Amino acid sequence: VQLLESGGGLVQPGGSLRLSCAASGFTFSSYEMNWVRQAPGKGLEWVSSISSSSRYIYYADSLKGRFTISRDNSKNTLYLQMNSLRAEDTAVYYCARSNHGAFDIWGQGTLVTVSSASTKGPSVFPLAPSSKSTSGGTAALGCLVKDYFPEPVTVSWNSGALTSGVHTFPAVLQSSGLYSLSSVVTVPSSSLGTQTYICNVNHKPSNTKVDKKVEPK
C-alpha cells in the first residue's frame, strides 16, 4: 500500500492550492481518508477526514472553513482545496488511512510554503580539501549550497557512487531570508589523487541541476 501526494508548492499569502493523494494496494472506497499537516520543526496537526464513499466529513476550527476535503472513490484519489491561504498554513501535508480507529497508512507528504518571497536557485561552491585536511587519513571535502528558496534541496556525490561518509546538513535559514546548507563527505587521504569528486545538487523548486567539481588546492 502506497499513498503519494502532489500539488504542494510555494504560494503567496491569500492564495489557493489543490493537493491530491493517490492510493494503491487497498480499496479506497472501503476506507476513510484524512489529511494531517506538520509545520517545519513543529508537531503534528490534524486537518480533515472523510468517510467511505464520502459519508462523513470533518475539519478543524483553526482553519475557518478555508479547507475543503473531497474524494473520487471511483478514482482512488483524495483532494484538498486550500483557499485564503495564510503564512501559518506552511507545512508538510500527509494523507492517512483510517482502519481501526487510527492512522495506519501515511503518505510521504508534500510541502506547501505560503510566503511572498520569490523562488531562487542555489549557488554551489567547493569546500576544497587541501593541506588543512590531515586527520590521519580521514580527509574531508564537500559543497556549499547557498542562497536558495524555497525548500528543499538534494545533494549526491559522484552520481550516487559515493555514499559512505556523506553528511548533508539540515538547511539553515540565513538572515537574508534564503536557505543555505553544506554536504560534506569524509574519504581516506590517499584517495585524493586517484578520484574526481563531484557534487550533484538538485533544487527542483527552481529547476536547478548543478554538478560541481571539487578539486583539492
Binding site: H100, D104, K132, H167, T186
Partner: protein, 208 residues
C-alpha cells in the same frame, strides 16, 4: 488536550517509557524517523500492526497513558507522537512530540576547516566552514576567531540527526563575511570545545 514530555534519553538495550497525559482515553502512538513521514506504532496496547517490532508496547491507563520501548536500538532515533480522538469536538488531538536520544559512549569530534572558494570570492561574498564530525554528545562549543578576536555572531550552525550506525553527531559552523570584511584579516581559525577533548582543538589557515 494531550501533553508529551519534550525529551526522553535512553541507553542501548535498555527500556524507555514515554508518557502522554490526557483527560481520558484509546491512545495511538506514531514514530517520526529523521526526515520521514510518521508511521503507526500501536492501535492500542499490544495491538501493534504488521512490521512494527514487538519491542514497542503500549499501556492502556485511564486518563493518562504511556508508551514503553524495550531493547533500545539505533534506529529508535525519532520524535514519538501520541494521538486520540476527542469525540466531544469530533477532532483528532496530538501530542507535543518526544525526541529520543540514544545514549552512547563519548566520542571525540573531528575538526575540519574550509576556506572560501575563489568562485564565491569572485561573487563578492566569502563563506568559511568548520566541520565537527561523528562526536558525542551533541553539546559542543565552536568558536570563530578572526585575528584572535571572537567572531561568533556572523556564524551559523547546523547539526545532523543521530546517526543510526554510530549514534554520533555531525555539526557544521559557517562564517559568512563580505569580500571587503574577509580581505581585512589574515588569521582565520576555528576552535572547538567538547567533552571528548582535554585541550581545545583549533583548525586555522591564512588568507594566502
Amino acid at each position: 488536550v494531550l501533553t508529551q514530555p519534550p525529551s526522553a534519553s535512553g541507553t542501548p538495550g535498555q527500556r524507555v517509557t514515554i508518557s502522554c497525559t490526557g483527560t481520558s482515553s484509546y491512545v495511538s502512538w506514531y514514530q517520526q524517523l529523521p526526515g520521514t513521514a510518521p508511521k503507526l506504532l500501536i492501535y492500542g496496547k499490544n495491538n501493534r500492526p504488521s512490521g512494527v517490532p514487538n519491542r514497542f508496547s503500549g499501556s492502556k491507563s485511564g486518563t493518562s497513558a504511556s508508551l514503553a520501548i524495550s531493547g533500545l536500538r539505533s534506529e529508535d532515533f525519532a520524535d514519538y507522537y501520541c494521538g486520540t480522538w476527542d469525540n466531544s469536538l469530533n477532532a483528532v488531538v496530538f501530542g507535543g512530540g518526544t525526541r529520543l536520544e540514544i545514549k552512547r559512549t563519548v566520542a571525540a569530534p573531528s575538526v575540519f576547516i574550509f576556506p572560501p572558494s575563489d568562485e564565491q570570492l569572485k561573487s563578492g561574498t566569502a563563506s568559511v566552514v568548520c566541520l565537527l564530525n561523528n562526536f558525542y554528545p551533541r553539546e559542543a562549543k565552536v568558536q570563530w576567531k578572526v585575528d584572535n578576536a571572537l567572531q561568533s555572531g556572523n556564524s551559523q550552525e547546523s547539526v545532523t540527526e543521530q546517526d543510526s550506525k554510530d549514534s554520533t553527531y555531525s555539526l557544521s559552523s559557517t562564517l559568512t563575511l563580505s569580500k571587503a570584511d574577509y580581505e581585512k584579516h589574515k588569521v582565520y581559525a576555528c576552535e572547538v570545545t567538547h567533552q571528548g577533548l582535554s585541550s581545545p582543538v583549533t583548525k586555522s589557515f591564512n588568507r594566502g
